[PDB]
Enzyme design. Structure first.
Site, PDB file in Angstrom:
ATOM      1  N   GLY A  61      -4.544   5.908  -3.971  1.00 57.39           N
ATOM      2  CA  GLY A  61      -5.281   4.775  -4.524  1.00 57.39           C
ATOM      3  C   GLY A  61      -6.094   5.130  -5.764  1.00 57.39           C
ATOM      4  CB  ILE A  73     -11.067   7.489  -5.540  1.00 60.73           C
ATOM      5  CG1 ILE A  73     -12.216   6.477  -5.726  1.00 60.73           C
ATOM      6  CG2 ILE A  73     -11.649   8.912  -5.454  1.00 60.73           C
ATOM      7  CD1 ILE A  73     -13.108   6.293  -4.504  1.00 60.73           C
ATOM      8  NE  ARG A 105     -17.496   5.722   3.836  1.00 66.31           N
ATOM      9  CZ  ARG A 105     -17.755   4.425   3.694  1.00 66.31           C
ATOM     10  NH1 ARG A 105     -17.784   3.618   4.752  1.00 66.31           N
ATOM     11  NH2 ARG A 105     -17.987   3.929   2.483  1.00 66.31           N
ATOM     12  CD  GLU A 152     -22.369  10.980   6.204  1.00 66.69           C
ATOM     13  OE1 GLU A 152     -21.210  11.449   6.049  1.00 66.69           O
ATOM     14  OE2 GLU A 152     -22.854  10.128   5.447  1.00 66.69           O
ATOM     15  CG  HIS A 178     -21.777  10.246   2.193  1.00 67.57           C
ATOM     16  ND1 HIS A 178     -20.985   9.897   1.116  1.00 67.57           N
ATOM     17  CD2 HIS A 178     -21.442   9.390   3.191  1.00 67.57           C
ATOM     18  CE1 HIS A 178     -20.185   8.895   1.458  1.00 67.57           C
ATOM     19  NE2 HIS A 178     -20.453   8.562   2.709  1.00 67.57           N
TER      20      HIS A 178
END
Lengths: 345, 344
Positions: B171, B173, B256, B285, B303
């Site tokens: 995609g 990114i 994620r 997280e 993050h």
């Protein structure tokens, strides 16, 4: 009739086929080093016979012979034509004294261009994004520290894209740093160097030349130091350079430690003139600054710039290939350093 | 009179002129948040009156309101037409329940493409060069530790140049990750995705497609994880994936945390299957794995993928512009997510 080559320290570790070929073309003689004084006496006594070349296959090999001073050099056989060595630096060697005795030298310039430029790019990313501080926060394993530092970093972090990189030096390593920063990251480029880049290189990188270090400091968001270390480059980046920089700016060094004054750097960070800095090389190496360590935003590494397996392969390729060209093919050295002399076949 | 806009959390921090314009065109109402249950009660009592939009200017703003579940959504005024928010991929929102009430949603897709791809490139450099270990050695301030680690790293460090990047997802990114890794660093590209790359992406990157995740794992020197997080991508990278990887390989994650199984990752490092790994995102997280912290070669960040001032400028521009277009100009949203609705 095979020419004779003195091996300083260990045999090859990376290129097995090339080293087998080298040992057929040439008679290779192990130095069997003990001490500096023992090596001088072996030369005086003609222990190794007449040889035409010396090879040194790694930076850490043959250190028992150090220093290569004028005294030791005066005992080398009259047959000697060429000395090829791994590494870019040669602090252990009196090159003028070697050249005065009519001996050609080659270092391994260019071998770590990819490694050192990649490491500089890592440092540039680190100082724009404050990633060094983020790593230390993550490594606490404390949830509230994670959240606090995530937020704090957003007050000061920026993308390289659109910002000006200032190149102090534009040699081969810096040309790769610039290609990666300009086309990869989207930075703009200004540079300062004793000779101009050619019209073609300048066009390819969009590189604009400035006339002074002051002009370079005034225009940069991040400065990249990549120059040869000499007397003229000792504390090249000093109090006066930092005074000319923009507030909240950044600096990286992959050259030699003393090129940047450690005390001038610390003062510029303490005042807020610099937001962040990245050093792979250190003024008092191997002693890293405890004052720099105790701060938030200084990225510090153990001189790993050229430390990659591919660099070491190229050290072995260049040293063997230089001696083959110069003594068997009638061709000049690829990587001479100092005076240049005629080849043979 | 002016349409009315509920503000979730802090006002603007970057685009002062555009924010002053926004406050002239629209009556902006501070939510004044305390707790989630307290916000539901406020909506039930009609404390804010009828409003036509909601705005959320930063990812960290308005978190006291979470979750935006079915029960919370059931008390929103029927006058509501649109909600625009910073960031993308929101575990806190029941998007189907919002669309059922005839409310259009926009995220800020694309704003962080430069920042997230640059941070992935940093982790790729780190895992090839063992730079994380080198930093910790330097920070001891001990000269003998400095020399010893300098030599140790030379036994295992490699240039990315000429090695294979295996992309899981291709995609927006990842296309930027691959452009920087291929043209900048000199890597070669192999990929898995649910859809084929356009003919121009493939030609530009020299991209070779494979059919399965085990095929991708086997071909790679470093794997890059960049896919949307959803039920079907939970533990996408698991024991079988690591079994398929080559000995001494590497992995990075900027997507994620739960996309990679923490326990499987720990085991693959313990055995020597993986040399090194880089994580910006963490399964549990904000607690980072204590087992991963205690190892030599795991790069760990808080993050920070999208965390850059230029990202935040674009979050503020997209949120404000989306609402202006949709309520005042009769124009469609720039960055819709979920169902699409006709503007007023």
């Amino acid at each position: 009739p095979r020419p004779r080559v003195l091996l300083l320290g260990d045999p090859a570790r990376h290129l097995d086929d090339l080293w087998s070929d080298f040992q057929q073309k040439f008679e290779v003689i192990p130095a069997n080093l003990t001490t500096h004084d023992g090596f001088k006496q072996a030369l005086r006594e003609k222990r190794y016979g007449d040889f035409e070349a010396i090879i040194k296959l790694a930076v850490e090999n043959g250190t028992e012979s150090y220093p290569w001073n004028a005294d030791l050099i005066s005992h080398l056989p009259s047959s000697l034509k060429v000395f090829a060595a791994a590494g870019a630096g040669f602090d252990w060697l009196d090159l003028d004294a070697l050249n005065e005795r009519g001996v050609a030298f080659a270092n391994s310039r260019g071998a770590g261009d990819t490694a050192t430029s990649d490491l500089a790019l890592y440092l540039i990313l680190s100082v724009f994004r404050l990633a060094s501080y983020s790593e230390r926060a993550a490594r606490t394993g404390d949830p509230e520290t994670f959240n606090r530092v995530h937020l704090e970093i957003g007050k000061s972090a920026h993308n390289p894209r659109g910002h000006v990189l200032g190149a102090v030096g534009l040699g081969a390593i810096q040309k790769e740093i610039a290609r990666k920063a300009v086309h990869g990251l989207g930075m703009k480029l200004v540079y300062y160097d004793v000779a101009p880049a050619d019209a073609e290189t300048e066009k390819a990188l969009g590189a604009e030349r400035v006339d002074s270090l002051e002009e370079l400091a005034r225009r940069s968001d991040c400065v990249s130091v990549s120059v040869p270390y000499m007397k003229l480059t000792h504390h090249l980046i000093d109090e006066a350079f930092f005074a000319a920089m923009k507030p909240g700016s950044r600096i990286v060094n992959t050259a030699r430690g003393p090129v940047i004054s450690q005390d001038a750097l610390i003062a510029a960070l303490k005042s807020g003139k610099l937001l962040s800095a990245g050093l792979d090389v250190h003024e008092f190496e191997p002693q890293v600054s405890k004052e720099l360590i105790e701060m938030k935003h200084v990225t510090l590494t153990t001189h790993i710039g050229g430390v990659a397996i591919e660099t070491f392969h190229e050290f072995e390729r260049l040293t063997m290939t230089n001696i083959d060209r110069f003594l068997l093919q009638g061709k000049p050295l690829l990587t001479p350093a100092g005076k240049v002399f005629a080849p043979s076949s």
